């Protein structure tokens, strides 16, 4: 109904995925998805609201209830969102992946009558097609995307990227039975498209995020303050999070370039508070700015005015898991090189990475630490190391030598939180890294640890200087 | 002598008192003008299915409806359309309890338990050819009373 604000943002190495899990496809290119911005805005808003509610009332509310409270700005099944997002990526005209030709009919030869796995690899600057049947044919091809020779190295060096590249790299072709040449050609052609689209990674995607506001949706009960809180949540999203895939590991990190209010009475305390990030001389200044914004919303800003509404719902402790910001855990270091930083994040977050190996020993707590702060991992009861030891370093009863005890994680008595921590595959990582830049050529590595609700009053002191050590070793 | 007009008078009395908001009354008036022609064209059972589908037979409104059979202080709550369909449903059921087509104890024990309203619909399906012939004048009187007493938009 009317333009509210306009934010020129900048994402570094976004890993946006579309229907094919890539930023480009045969039909269009899309580096920034407005639906992802909306979803991450709502996710950060819920994190920020539980942060607030816990820094005043010590209470934590379900995501359902939080979004039911904010459904006047973000909309729900019962009400249309009052805010309309409009991404404008400059240069965002028609671009798509076109495979002008690929010179197979030699790979098809060495494939027939067999059952082989056709692996690919794009380093050496020429696409080779490894075959586990012991042959490596170099493939000639012409595409529309020009992999800049920096992207090949960024993918070959980053152990996380080259890991998530296993899924876009191979097919197990079975030509034992009736197998013409044409359909094998299309199979390998789509495999090559799926592999090449993965390398559409650009550095410094720059877009303009407009926000429109429906005024017709009146100040029903607490619209203005809900909206201000949502705009603060959007700023916190732009400051602490990124867009796209693996934002917990620095990719897609956002950075402000320009903010412009158009309705002072609502946002003129976000306009300047984001101007507070167009120039960041040192790391300490940035950490101070972040603590400033974080504290502002904590006590000084709006109030408990709408938390007094009886629509929220306190979380069950043993059946729910919510996240919230902890102001203490906000290490900042100057970057001097972004690609190497992203590659060292793996040293930070891998159980055999030579930074957490040099910050944590006994390996058990190490596993434990990552299992509690590195999202889901695939541990299985086969060779003892899981037996008891890591179960011990997570008991909420039973000792205090580990500074982190999961709420209902029980010794052989796993009911819900045990399976959630050890089996639930889709678990975000609490330890997160981000990279920021300003209008100057200053770049900083934030490393933070979101506070979760399955920690039984974690020792905020041990993990705090674990985080400075990690942030040092990876920069 | 046309006693179905007296039965319509007393049923209309009960439902005209049980509808607090005037919008509910006007909705009942539209129901009365439509559903009698509908049961003429389409038969009793399709119209009854339509009615109970638009009536929202929750145990709440079911209980207010049961209390109407005795109290004359009961009230029908809900949206105007919902209560109008419930009022027309009470009209039909009232005609059925009177004229002895259905025992009142069976009707009440069915409106209570959800596992028995199905048996109620089964019995009504068995009796529909009789009901279709009997209730025509009663429903026409209901419609006349509605368009006589309740004003329209």
């Amino acid at each position: 109904e009317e333009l509210l604000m306009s934010l020129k943002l900048k994402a570094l190495y976004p890993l946006t995925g579309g229907y094919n899990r890539h930023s480009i496809n045969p039909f269009y290119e899309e580096l920034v998805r407005p639906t992802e911005i909306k979803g991450l805005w709502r996710w950060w808003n819920r994190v920020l609201f539980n942060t607030l509610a816990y820094s005043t009332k010590g209470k934590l509310y379900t995501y359902e209830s939080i979004d039911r409270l904010f459904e006047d700005v973000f909309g729900s099944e019962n009400k249309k969102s009052a805010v309309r997002l409009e991404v404008i990526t400059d240069e965002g005209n028609d671009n798509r992946f076109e495979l002008s030709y690929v010179e197979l009919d030699k790979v098809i030869d060495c494939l027939r009558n067999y059952k082989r796995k056709v692996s690919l690899d794009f380093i050496d600057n020429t696409l080779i097609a490894e075959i586990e049947g012991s042959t490596k044919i170099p493939i000639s091809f012409k595409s529309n995307l020009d992999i800049d020779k920096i992207i090949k190295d960024l993918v070959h060096n980053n152990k996380l990227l080259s890991f998530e590249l296993l899924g876009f790299k191979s097919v197990e072709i079975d030509a034992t039975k009736i197998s013409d040449k044409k359909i094998l050609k299309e199979i390998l052609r789509d495999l090559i498209t799926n592999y090449l689209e993965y390398f559409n990674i650009k550095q410094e995607v720059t877009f303009t995020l407009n926000i429109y506001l429906d005024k017709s949706r009146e100040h029903k009960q607490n619209f203005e303050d809900k909206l201000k809180f949502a705009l603060y949540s959007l700023l916190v999203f732009i400051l602490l999070g990124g867009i796209g895939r693996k934002t917990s590991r620095g990719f897609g990190s956002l950075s402000i370039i320009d903010v412009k209010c158009y309705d002072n009475s609502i946002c003129k305390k976000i306009e300047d508070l984001a101007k507070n990030f167009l120039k960041i001389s040192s790391g300490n200044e940035l950490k101070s700015k972040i603590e400033s914004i974080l504290d502002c919303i904590k006590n000084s800003c709006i109030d408990t005015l709408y938390i007094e509404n009886n629509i929220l719902s306190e979380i069950d402790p043993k059946k729910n898991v919510v996240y919230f910001i902890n102001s203490d855990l906000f290490e900042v270091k100057r970057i001097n090189d972004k690609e190497k930083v992203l590659a060292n994040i793996y040293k930070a977050v891998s159980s055999e990475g030579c930074c957490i190996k040099s910050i944590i020993t006994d390996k058990y707590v190490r596993k434990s630490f990552l299992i509690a702060f590195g999202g889901y991992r695939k541990v299985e009861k086969d060779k003892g190391l899981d037996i008891g030891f890591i179960k011990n370093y997570l008991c909420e009863t039973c000792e205090t030598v580990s500074s982190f005890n999961i709420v209902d994680f029980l010794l052989s008595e796993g009911s819900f939180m045990s399976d959630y921590i050890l089996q639930y595959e889709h678990r975000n990582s609490l330890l997160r890294f981000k990279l920021i830049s300003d209008n100057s050529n200053n770049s900083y590595l934030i490393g933070y640890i979101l506070h979760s609700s399955y920690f039984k009053k974690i020792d905020i002191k041990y993990v705090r200087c674990i985080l400075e050590k990690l942030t040092y070793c990876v920069i | 002598y046309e006693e179905d007009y007296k039965l319509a008078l007393e049923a209309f009395k009960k439902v005209f008192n049980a509808l607090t908001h005037y919008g509910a009354k006007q909705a009942f008036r539209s129901r009365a003008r439509d559903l009698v022609e509908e049961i003429y064209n389409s038969g009793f059972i399709p119209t009854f299915f339509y009615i109970i589908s638009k009536a929202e037979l929750n145990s709440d409104s079911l209980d207010s409806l049961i209390s109407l059979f005795s109290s004359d202080n009961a009230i029908l709550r809900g949206s105007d359309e919902n209560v109008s369909y419930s009022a027309y449903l009470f009209i039909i059921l009232y005609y059925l309890i009177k004229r002895g087509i259905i025992e009142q104890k069976f009707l009440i024990q069915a409106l209570r338990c959800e596992k028995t309203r199905l048996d109620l619909i089964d019995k009504l399906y068995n009796l529909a050819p009789i009901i279709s012939a009997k209730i025509r004048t009663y429903l026409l009187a209901i419609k006349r009373l509605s368009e006589a007493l309740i004003e329209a938009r």
Partner: protein
């Protein structure tokens, strides 16, 4: 555990001296938050015993009694005249439902002997007579819900909620 006792709401006030544990527990079954009463229980096949009104066992599925359910134990002056029972919180007819219940409840119900001495002939009686609704909202609605006039200020509705929702069959004998 969690025990609840039944409070009939007739036009005969046997209620000034009927309960000691007003709330006792940290909850109730019935609730009132400015939308009227909620979670009202209905009991069918029984009728009141208006002379010290209590629920006598009839067998007419049309004879129903509506009351509120509040936690507590009767007077420690009973247990030779009531019918206690336990049901899993979904096996009870509850009107104006607003929440969900604790899946397992013990229920004390005021109860009378069948008194096989004279034919129980019941009549459907309402709740009229503003004086009666006033001493009803005085006896039970005040002591059991001191939310009256302290958090509930629109008491106009709660009295219409008993003038229309509440009703029952009475022995009159």
């Amino acid at each position: 555990s969690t025990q609840r006792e039944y409070v009939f709401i007739p036009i005969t006030n046997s209620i000034t001296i009927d309960v000691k544990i007003t709330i006792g527990g940290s909850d109730h079954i019935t609730n009132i938050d400015e939308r009227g009463i909620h979670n009202v229980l209905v009991i069918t096949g029984y009728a009141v015993d208006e002379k010290n009104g209590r629920l006598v066992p009839t067998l007419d599925p049309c004879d129903y009694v509506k009351g509120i359910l509040v936690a507590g134990t009767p007077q420690q002056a009973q247990s030779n005249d009531f019918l206690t029972l336990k049901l899993p919180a979904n096996k009870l007819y509850l009107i104006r439902k607003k929440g969900n219940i604790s899946d397992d409840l013990k229920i004390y119900i005021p109860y009378s002997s069948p008194d096989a001495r004279n034919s129980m002939k019941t009549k459907p009686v309402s709740i009229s007579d503003d004086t009666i609704v006033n001493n009803i909202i005085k006896e039970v609605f005040d002591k059991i819900y001191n939310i009256t006039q302290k958090e509930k200020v629109k008491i106009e509705k709660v009295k219409e909620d008993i003038k229309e929702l509440f009703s029952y069959y009475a022995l009159e004998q």
